[PDB]
Amino acid sequence: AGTHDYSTALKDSIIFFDANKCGPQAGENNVFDWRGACHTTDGSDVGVDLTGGYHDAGDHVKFGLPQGYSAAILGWSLYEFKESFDATGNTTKMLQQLKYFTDYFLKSHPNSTTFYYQVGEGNADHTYWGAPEEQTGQRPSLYKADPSSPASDILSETSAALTLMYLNYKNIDSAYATKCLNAAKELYAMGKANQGVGNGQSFYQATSFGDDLAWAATWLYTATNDSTYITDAEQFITLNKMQDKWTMCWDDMYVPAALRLAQITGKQIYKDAIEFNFNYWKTQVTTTPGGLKWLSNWGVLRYAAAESMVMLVYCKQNPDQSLLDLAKKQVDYILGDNPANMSYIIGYGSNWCIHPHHRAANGYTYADNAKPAKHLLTGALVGGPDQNDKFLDDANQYQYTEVALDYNAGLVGVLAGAIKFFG
């Protein structure tokens, strides 16, 4: 299409998070009238209030790595493209989504050396299909990080999310912002003190933490101007990921970390890492007949949006028309410029997905979970099509209909960037 409404898509992509809010206050200032208080006793098994935060995807477990990653990427979006949010009147709502994340992180850090990062057990949670408000019983505070239990990647992403909140909220509530920075410093300290990846069951199997430590370190530098953090960062990022053939996602933050280090240190090694990844996506990554960069089969649009966001952040200082064109094509494809003639953002554009893999939106139980979703899950980015640009909008095809926090995190960022460069 000659013109696209990036403004409305941005608003919708932010609104999506309201559908996954968890806790006694989940329904407060929530755009969806079908969402209410849920899992109000989280943390009761360990004597700590662990309510709040967000359900991970179509399920209700709160997984630490994607929870932290999502909060960090959303915070990065606001930090780099603030003008886009202000101009479209989305800053207020965005800040509310972010504070819902940070309030949860702070409550999950009872003392300086402890951090609870998973509420719920994946296997059991998935045997349930119904509204989160009616899921009773006891959820276990399954995992926590402490001096004897490492979770460097989770702790670092959470630290980055908290530091970004300090940067994005200091002008609104400096006291709360500082509380976030102090917590961010402590979580980072925990992460480098005992090194190793955190636990995510078989659902979120992590493979690297050096990328996260480096990433968290660059933000602490931006907030404190303390060079020691960069000394740490240069060491952690090298723990060959300098030739990353993947992209930014919950498990791999090597590209974003390299981008910030190139900006902060000016070293060629980091500039080369970014150039490699970008050039790899330009010609090596599979391209569907429809023009979509297809990295892998699961959450394919999530990957295209994430890489595009990184390229747009890079373009702020180093405008490269080849990058802007690539990024714009991926975004436009998601919005409706594709062989399937459908918007991949539910509730936006035309002929959107009617079978999202989301319990709350579905609205049925085991009496009809195969019927079309009863409620409109506005703003959700679905898994996406196959390498032939085909989309199967039906009940059991999860690869196509899955939705998740980490999927939308990158979408918000790229849309904010699109408004700046093409808006």
Q: List, as residue ranges, the binding site.
A: 22, 38-39, 55, 208, 211-212, 251
Instruction: Establish whether 393 is a catalytic residue.
Output: yes
Restricting to residues 310-349, which ones interact with Ca ion according to CB under 5 A? Answer: none
The whole-angstrom separation of Cα 179 and Cα 167 is 12
Helices first, then strands: H and E counts in the chain: 16, 3
The whole-angstrom separation of Cα 65 and Cα 99 is 17
Residue (59 or 244) nearer to Zn ion, CB: 59
In terms of DSSP H, where are the helices of 252-404? Answer: 254-265, 268-283, 300-317, 321-335, 359-362, 398-401
Which of these ranges, 129-137, 210-218, 240-248, 346-354, lies near Ca ion under the rule CB under 5 A? 210-218
Residue numbers of the site for Ni ion (CB under 5 A)? 1, 332, 337
Residue from 179, 246, 176, 187 nearest 212 by CA: 187
Q: Could you say which of 11, 39, 293, 328 contacts Zn ion (CB under 5 A)? A: 39
Q: Could you say which of 42, 59, 125, 153 contacts Ca ion (CB under 5 A)? A: 153
Residue (22 or 309) nearer to Zn ion, CB: 22
Determine which one of 186, 337, 402, 406 is catalytic: 402
Q: Does 195 bind Ca ion (CB under 5 A)?
A: no
| Residue 53 half-sphere exposure toward CB, CA atoms < 13 A | 32
Q: State the pairing for strand pair 115-119/143-145.
A: antiparallel
| Residue 417 half-sphere exposure toward CB, CA atoms < 13 A | 33
Residue (1 or 175) nearer to Ni ion, CB: 1
Residue (334 or 382) nearer to Ni ion, CB: 334
The whole-angstrom separation of Cα 244 and Cα 5 is 33
Closest residue to Zn ion using C-beta atoms: 22
Q: 337 contacts which partner out of Zn ion, Ni ion, Ca ion, none, CB within 5 to 8 A by kind?
A: Ni ion
Determine which one of 5, 133, 146, 393 is catalytic: 393
> Rounded to the nearest whole angstrom, what is the least distance from the CB of residue 350 to Ca ion in the complex?
37
Residue 18 is given by DSSP the state G
Sign of torsion over alpha carbons 229, 232, 238, 241: negative
Q: Could you say which of 38, 274, 327, 373 contacts Zn ion (CB under 5 A)? A: 38
Instruction: Establish whether 402 is a catalytic residue.
Output: yes
Taking phi over 0 as left and psi of -120 to 50 as alpha, with beta for the rest, 346 belongs to beta
Site size for Ca ion (CB under 5 A): 4
> Rounded to the nearest whole angstrom, what is the least distance from the CB of residue 348 to Ca ion in the complex?
31
> Rounded to the nearest whole angstrom, what is the least distance from the CB of residue 28 to Zn ion in the complex?
13
Residue (24 or 196) nearer to Zn ion, CB: 24
Q: How far is CA 32 from CA 19, 150, 187, in A?
A: 7, 37, 33
CB 334 within 8 A of CB 302: no
> Rounded to the nearest whole angstrom, what is the least distance from the CB of residue 38 to Zn ion in the complex?
3
Q: Does 22 bind Zn ion (CB under 5 A)?
A: yes
Q: Could you say which of 42, 56, 157, 211 contacts Ca ion (CB under 5 A)? A: 211
Taking phi over 0 as left and psi of -120 to 50 as alpha, with beta for the rest, 15 belongs to alpha
Q: 22 contacts which partner out of Ca ion, Ni ion, Zn ion, none, CB within 5 to 8 A by kind?
A: Zn ion
The token pair at 5 is: 């409404």
Restricting to residues 118-137, which ones interact with Zn ion according to CB under 5 A? Answer: 132
Site size for Zn ion (CB under 5 A): 4
Residue (45 or 332) nearer to Ni ion, CB: 332
Residue from 273, 209, 271 nearest 240 by CA: 273
Question: Which residue carries 């209700």 as its tokens?
Answer: 60
The residues annotated as belonging to the active site are 393, 402
Footprint of Zn ion (CB under 5 A): 22, 38-39, 132
